[model samples]
Target: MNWKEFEVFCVTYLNKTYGNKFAKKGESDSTTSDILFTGNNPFYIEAKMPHSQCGQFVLIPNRAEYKFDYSPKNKSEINPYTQKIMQFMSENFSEYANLSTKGKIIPLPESVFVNWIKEYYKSKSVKFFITSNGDFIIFPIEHFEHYFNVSCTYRIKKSGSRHLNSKSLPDFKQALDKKGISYTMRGLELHSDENIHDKRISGDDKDFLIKENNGAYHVKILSNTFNANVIFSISLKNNISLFILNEDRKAFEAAISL
Candidate 1:
């Protein structure tokens, strides 16, 4: 069998092993990763097929090439991938960080992505693992922020609906303002997917649907930028509680919305 066939076999075996008690069959989230295990301790897993196979099949040490785009000319040219890797190291390998490169490239596997996350949370008392084939193994987040170096923040605020009418844009803005939420408005145009030959929208629009009564509209809200600590603070205060209160409802609502 080819590598892809092996990958399928591995996933099937994993589902039978770790997935039997916790996860629902064939219900993995495909976007962020794949093979999510849901139960008392919910976590995520991903799979990847690297260009070359390793000799031993142990989880490789976290490296830049595993998760970042790398392009090297002669040994002389500055390697942006290496530079970014060094920066991450200097920042103590932050989990909630962004690396912007100046090139068109495909992303590395989610397993590698989660490896960095695991490292970032190592001191903070979180345990997680990622299989070389892109599977996520989650651990407890008991001890956190112990050896953290960088401070970055993130926010998730609900803005206007994607199907809101043009006339309603102002009202949406007004409502957010009344609630002390800040946002920016912009127009969105529909486009077709290059790969699927189907009418589609980009980014959030891929999941957003419009009815006959309303033309397709899309809006987004970005919270004020801050360090990771700040973002998590907001999440802990406002969002995390929501997940704890009714995770099933949240999942059901998410499915329905999609």
Candidate 2:
């Protein structure tokens, strides 16, 4: 089944199952909550439908941002890997190129972003998936897999270029005046795909985290006359792959009280 039909089915099934009015978010609404249910048990639902050809369901299809801060120079706490990226960009400015927009692009390992996604999705209340084999499954966030991975590339796009005209170094605190020079780093490009194995003893049950190569995480760097402010933004896609394994039938049955 296609995505639109599945969405309609979910809206109808959920409303009928719970006797509550449930609504599907618009096609372009980028929030994590796909199906918005506002009733006695108000909760958000993430919907998934398996691919017709590959049988792999899409978890996050669009790129959405996660927000963070990286300003160790200002005694701001940041992730070590994030700090490493910042420093790397600062030194090897040449490695970054004007790829898509006008920012420099940096290809990185998925290790830098997997945790953010896990933590983000963990906050969701429920997940709904229609297996490729045509099994309807609904489970709490906890039942979801934990060892998932991601692959993405980053780009640093800037806006409002500030002319630096100082004999010495521009004052990190008071060099930029009225001129708002901002640098935004985005994870716009997705990397190649890898076979994501399912948690099984020795079966061919496998899931794929397919890459669409769209969307970005925006990092806003604002420079004042005296100093600069750094903001790291993460916009992860809405459609990430949350595979339905053969071994997960028990949990799926339990979810529906089958």
Candidate 3:
């Protein structure tokens, strides 16, 4: 992946995938960034062309005027960007050093990404630049989260709606039992786990929502303000969908067709 092909491929590629408000070149300084967009830019994407699997790669501070050094002792005063990423890796991903390639020069996929929140969250970094394309930039997490949350908040303002069908309760109750998860539903007098007291009286038993944390689902449905790890919202009949929750990030998505 020659860098000569990066600048051209970067914008062209992003335009096709991002599929939104014009993502254009940042004609100002490459050090600051290589691209920018119109309205909301949650992802501070930076392009790279690394070739490895253990996530080893490099990016020039100033693409217009930058170079790397190949000497053992004289590399410092030359490649500052290289020095920066190397230091970052040492400090944050030291445990993974045993899996690196002693700094070889080959195109590595997922070769450049880090934990945006630091520590225990390294798993949340950008997985890779495109899975196959070696010319574009990869998306950062914190930035995208910030961008996505803002987008969601902006859209779900004033009033949103929820539709539930009482007819689904009997079927959903049976499905729960099939999964080996015990539950008792006496004409809507739902009692999932003992000691929690029978949810006997009021509220429609047919319509209920479960929120979860760390894969263990909760019977409480929290407000949009809180972080929803796994949301198993029973809206309608088998009209229900298995939305595998990923706690913070699912990394993948599914489009459910009603």
Candidate 4:
């Protein structure tokens, strides 16, 4: 659905679930609620939507900034939206007692987004689940595992004006092969250096040099600003595997329930 349609759906669903009995109405605020519902407990919710359904989105506790303030310089800053969330949770919900003080950006996989409703009821203790769409899954706690891993390495560049050449790809592959690391090519993009005359390398490149050099070992060659003789190796691990077991369990349970 379009953004507008999705927004309307969100407002209607929320009102129907917590309106009048737990939440008050407001005339001036279309995006903000008046008499907020605490949803059986004192908690907060932050609803977010991407530019489009195909875009990315996430859901954080309404008072996340206050609970997880990274910038000590602005600890006193108050977010009203979060306050509303807290009010709703505290009054209506009975699971969440307090919000998490650690501010974190949680990434939700497609499986979590699609089965959000069921997951919410299953994990009633969870407080938040972010989504690319507006359909968020709220609970008392978050229990998802992180997957991405990064590493650094240093190498010497080949002698030439061209810092990054086609030969570099093979050289990187050869190194991974020797090391027996396993990896896959996720994506690749080229980038140009503005400081140098015609020096350029792929920035944010995801092309994996070795497919099965070792167990889940992926490598990428990055071009840098240094012209002398410097090369670096960046390593990454795809996190999909980490959540595979839990996701499969949820799916199995959902199927049984159906």
Candidate 5:
């Protein structure tokens, strides 16, 4: 797997584990980072997924603290350390009180985030990884290099754990198959194995469907810019929550409107 593919796997893993996602990836990235918990301190990560055998874990960038794309880091960069600082300052009138203004947000020193994250990740368990096929796996933190460097890799529950099945896509397809619906030969259909950004789903025609747990699912093509609006419009009509994989944000957004 490559950067974008590996990146999405991490995002989905976080949702399944932490039960939350951020407004966008984070300020560290081009549009956003690989994963960001919109609700908590930033976990904006940069990833690289090199295919490996059953039991593999690599953490070579010994220095650990890292940077990306530009010379200076973003000001809003938040992580576990930042979260701790905020909590401590708010709960106590400590020396750093000036850095905290009761009701407003506090900005931390940009120089410290990489250090903070390195420390935080080092202490946790149940880390995640991406596969050669752009899928995910949950693993014990022990197998992962918490103080990660430019890139890291670990298979699952431990370095040797089994990779997870891509059940969501296959289940959705099986559900559709049971319903007697068929995909178009006009273009590549969107399914567990296909991308929404594919020419088939992104056309002006703007109609698509997917299914899960023997239940049917539908999609509309939209631009990446109006994704918020599309998500809102879809919410009022459906009971289930919706998620857009990293690769398809633009596909669904294009379906929104002209």
Candidate 6:
């Protein structure tokens, strides 16, 4: 499948694996975040397929929307990267505006764009980077900065469009190994062929539902609003399997919103 098709697959895989928390974003979206998480966990996701292009991930693609066209006075809501672009446009508004209006792409320096990537992750929740093969790497932006360095390559096409790419590094794995960091990295496991049924269990406190599943344990909330805000974290050990059905994803979102 093509990269676009893979992106759609990634979103569905994540939602089914982790819970119904992932929403696909528009392809022309100017932001780096490709997938939107609507669940309680506030975070973003960027999906890549390095193998699709010889171990290179396209961080920013050359699109007309990537060009600067904002007012210099309207910098309050703009991101630093775009702000820098706008500043350049402000200096030569007439020339750049004409080029932009003509559908020619205005580009940013590779270094400036790289710094923008760094700034975007500052003090934010964990951002997940996943590949098409079900492999993923998740970390807060700072941790990414500390352990890995992005190697950027800028390219301009004959059509006047340009893109920025990052080279994948094997040094990342070595660094994590040297640090003795053993994060729980699990492979994506799906069992669609199995006949699964919802089982109901009621306790003295409240009623709940459970689905016998695999890979990750999901917890579904009950009707009692008093238990609404409660987060159920499951701990698995040995051969025993236990998990609550995540069928109440919407209910959980509603619970948190309330």
Measured with C-alpha atoms, the lDDT of residue 123 in candidate 5 is 35
TM-score of 3: 0.25
Expressed as tens digits, the lDDT of each residue in 1-258 for candidate 5 is 445545566666556654555222443343433443343233333343543211111111112222111112332344554444434434443332222112222244422333443444443311222222223333222323321222111111111111112433344345445545555321222434333332222222222232232322233233222100000000011121123233233331232222
Model 6 spans > 4 angstroms off: 51-116, 121-126, 132-134, 145-149, 153-258
User: lDDT by residue for model 6 over 71-180, one digit each (tens)?
Assistant: 23321234666466556645544543332211333355545544455455442332544453234333333322322333322222122111111221223223334545
Per-residue CA lDDT of candidate 4, range 1-258, in tens? 754444445555556744533333344343332223454443223233432111111222235333222122321222443233334433433233232322221232323332332233233322332222223332222332222121111122222222234546555445534545443332322222222222222323422331222223223444332211111111122334534545644642332234
The lDDT of model 6 is 0.40
- Cα TM-score per model: 0.24, 0.37, 0.25, 0.22, 0.22, 0.34
lDDT of each: 0.32, 0.39, 0.31, 0.31, 0.31, 0.40
Model 6 lowest lDDT segment of ten: 226-235
Better of 1 and 3 by TM-score: 3
How far residue 37's Cα lies from its native spot in candidate 3, in Å, is: 3.0
Alpha-carbon RMSD, candidate 5: 22.5
Question: Residue 57, candidate 3: how far off, in angstroms?
Answer: 15
The predicted structure with the larger lDDT, 1 or 2, is: 2
Q: Which prediction has the highest TM-score against the true structure?
A: 2
- Candidate with the greatest lDDT versus the true structure: 6
Between prediction 5 and prediction 6, the one with superior lDDT is 6
